Amino acid sequence: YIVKTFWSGSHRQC
Amino acid sequence: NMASLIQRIARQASLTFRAPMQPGFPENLSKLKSLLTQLRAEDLNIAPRKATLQPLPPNLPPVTYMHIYETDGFSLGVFLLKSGTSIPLHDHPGMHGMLKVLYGTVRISCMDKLDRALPPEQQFEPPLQPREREAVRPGVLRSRAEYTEASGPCILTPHRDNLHQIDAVEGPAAFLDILAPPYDPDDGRDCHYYRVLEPVDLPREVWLLETPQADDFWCEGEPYPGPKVFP
Ligand SMILES: [Cl-]
Ligand SMILES: [Cl-]
Ligand SMILES: [Co+2]
């Protein structure tokens, strides 16, 4: 899934 | 009577990042660097992690992140790299960054985009597809060195060393990272990944191709065990 993180931007967290 | 070192780092980061233009910035950045130079893994209650010598199963991430604090001005946390892993080459658009190795050894490769067309006869290995040949852009490889907890902090800025790749060398490694401002995809500040291309001494010109986040790279959060940063 994609999460908008402040620590690596748009991140595919999987 | 004395706040924890990580509290003091967060306070100084807030003062420092509220760009080059502001006055007092260089002095505040120097003070922040001196605080980071003093930081050790034990100050964050993080024990150094050593290799398992076992393969990494497909369901676990190669890298994890411990969140410490974030404001609109900066983000503060720890990235923890397992043995044999890398954070692929990426940029930090319009951002400053500061990194301090906590344990282990990392190889940091530092690069910048040069702001040109690929010459028609140029070839790479592996060969590029047509859409990739259209998209490649010139860059400069500025440095490629190994860093440990004794190296002191590494800095990047919007226009220098803004692209970096971070490899865990001979086992797990971890580093504290400060980004300022943090990423903000909805504000148009996102993280872009790149490949450096080998055609067929530093600084030297290279070719850069923007690429999706690698299939075998992602990062998951894990609990931060150290002293807490309080408003
Ligand atoms: Cl206090
Ligand atoms: Cl090619
Ligand atoms: Co980075």
Author numbering:
A (entry chain B): 1 to 14
B (entry chain A): 5 to 22, 41 to 137, 145 to 229, 240 to 270
The authors write:
N-terminal cysteine oxidases (NCOs) act as enzymatic oxygen (O2) sensors, coordinating cellular changes to hypoxia in animals and plants. They regulate the O2-dependent stability of proteins bearing an N-terminal cysteine residue through the N-degron pathway. In animals, the Cys branch of the N-degron pathway is regulated by the NCO 2-aminoethanethiol dioxygenase (ADO), which also plays a role in cysteamine catabolism and taurine biosynthesis. Biochemically, ADO is a non-haem iron-dependent thiol dioxygenase (TDO) from the cupin fold family of enzymes, consisting of a conserved double stranded β-helix (DSBH) core in which the active site is situated.
CP6-L8 was replaced with 2,3-diaminopropionic acid (Dap; d), an amino acid that contains a sidechain amine linked to one carbon, from which the dipeptides Lys-Ser, Phe-Ser, and Gly-Ser were appended, to mimic the N-termini of known NCO substrates (RGS4/5, IL32, and RAP2 [an NCO target in plants,10], respectively; Fig. 3c). No additional interactions are observed except, possibly, weak water-mediated hydrogen bonds between the second amide of CP6-L8d-Gly-Ser and the sidechain hydroxyls of ADO-Y212 and -Y222, as these water molecules are absent in the CP6-L8K-Ser structure. The crystal structures of cobalt-incorporated ADO in complex with CP6-L8K-Ser and CP6-L8d-Gly-Ser provide valuable information on substrate analogue binding. However, they do not reflect native conditions in which an iron cofactor interacts with an Nt-Cys residue. To corroborate that the crystal structures of cobalt-incorporated ADO in complex with CP6-L8K-Ser and CP6-L8d-Gly-Ser are biologically relevant, molecular dynamic (MD) simulations were conducted with different combinations of active site metal and pseudo-N-terminal substrate residues over 100 ns. In each instance, no changes in hydrogen bonding distance were observed, with Ser and Cys interacting with cobalt(II) and iron(II) through ligation of both their amine and hydroxyl/thiol groups, supporting bidentate coordination of the substrate. MD was also used to calculate the binding energies associated with CP6-L8d-Gly-Ser/Cys complex formation, verifying key residue interactions, most notably the contributions of ADO-Y87 and CP6-W7, ADO-W257 and CP6-C14, ADO-Y212 and CP6-L8d-Gly-Ser/Cys, all of which were highlighted above during assessment of the crystal structure.
